[PDB]
């Protein structure tokens, strides 16, 4: 999904997912969620058309 | 015996298809072949680094063709800016349509 | 006062106006300076600034121009100096258009007030276009592509109603003005609004 996001230059929608996903229950291990928190924080960085700074 | 850079090869191939130097070179030589043999050869193997290699040690001769190279070796697609391609192509076709060095038309 | 004109005058007859606007500039003659720095950035709005090109040579200058020129609250006609003010921000927006910084260059182009992006604002812009420097109009044909394909970017990342809205005005202000090749260009400016839908 934040694959296709992303592509579309909706990084800010990409950056939410991951986020969410980092701090959720689901099992996953630490280090993913250190490579989702930083996909999003970059993704977040970084302009998206239609949503505020 | 390993095989040796593509430098070292491209200079031991000029030692051989090439023994003696022909009069109509330009822009001297680079540890002992002429710069654009140089030049040429190794971009026919492929091997832009080699021939960037040559490029700095003839920095002072070869004039603003450094800059140009450069941003040959950069961008991809093999090609250039329309900017720059444009400033080169005016320069070859203004006063070098028809150069001694056939290896200086070829670059 | 005389001869700085007088030699200024030669070198723009003599096509040399970088040299010209120089030596007007000398002598704070700013009707001639924008004139003519009018004419050697409208060629270079939409092209690529990069080291040591000439752009970056040419909107360094008339940026150290704009300077001295508020600072010291000079202007020509409103005509000749609108314009040089008006191309100095488009100069700036394909430099942000061409770096990547997509919203950046949008911001810019919609307080220009230069392309209509809502269907109500046409009738003016179209209105306006007609009394605008040449020097802006041969640009118009960069400008909407610019424009479109930033759009058509964001578009790719309601919203979506929104940019299809906006893609809509910039065809039908196309449409309604005649300019540098407006057969090629509303051409590709209809396809990228297809492409969104």
Redesign the interface.
């Known amino acids: 999904l934040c694959r296709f996001?992303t592509?579309?230059?909706?990084?800010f929608e990409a950056a939410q997912v991951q986020t969410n996903l980092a701090k959720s229950d689901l099992n996953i291990s630490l280090k993913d969620r250190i490579i989702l928190l930083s996909r999003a924080k970059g993704n977040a960085s970084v302009?998206?058309?239609?949503i505020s700074r | 015996g390993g095989v040796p850079g593509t430098y070292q090869l491209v200079r031991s191939f000029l030692n051989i298809k090439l023994p003696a130097p022909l009069p109509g070179l330009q822009d001297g030589e680079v540890e002992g072949h002429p710069v654009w043999a140089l030049i040429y050869y190794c971009m026919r193997c492929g091997d832009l680094l080699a021939a960037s290699q040559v490029v700095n040690r003839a920095q002072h001769q070869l004039g603003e063709f450094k800059t140009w190279f450069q941003e040959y070796m950069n961008s991809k697609d093999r090609r250039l800016s329309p900017a720059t391609e444009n400033k080169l192509r005016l320069h070859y076709r203004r006063a070098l349509r028809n150069n001694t060095d056939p290896y200086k038309r070829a670059v | 006062k005389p001869i700085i004109n007088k030699v200024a005058s030669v070198a723009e007859n003599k096509g040399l106006f970088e040299e010209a606007a120089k030596l007007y500039d000398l002598a704070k003659n700013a009707d001639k300076v924008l004139e003519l720095m009018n004419k050697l950035l409208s060629p270079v709005v939409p092209q690529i600034s990069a080291p040591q090109s000439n752009k970056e040579r040419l909107k360094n200058m008339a940026l150290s121009i704009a300077e001295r020129y508020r600072a010291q609250g000079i202007s020509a006609n409103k005509f000749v100096d609108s314009t040089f003010y008006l191309l100095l921000d488009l100069i700036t927006f394909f430099d942000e258009y061409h770096s990547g910084h997509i919203d950046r260059a949008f911001d810019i182009i919609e307080r220009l007030k230069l392309v209509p992006l809502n269907q109500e604002s046409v009738e003016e812009r179209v209105a306006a276009f007609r009394n605008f420097s040449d020097e802006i109009r041969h640009n118009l044909s960069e400008v909407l592509l610019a424009t479109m394909n930033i759009l058509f970017t964001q578009f790719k990342r309601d919203r979506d109603s929104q940019l299809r809205s906006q893609a809509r005005t910039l065809i039908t202000f196309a449409g309604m003005i005649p300019y540098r090749t407006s057969g090629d260009t509303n051409a590709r400016l209809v396809q990228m609004e297809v492409l969104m839908n």
């Open positions: 996001y592509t579309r230059s909706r990084f302009n998206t058309i239609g």
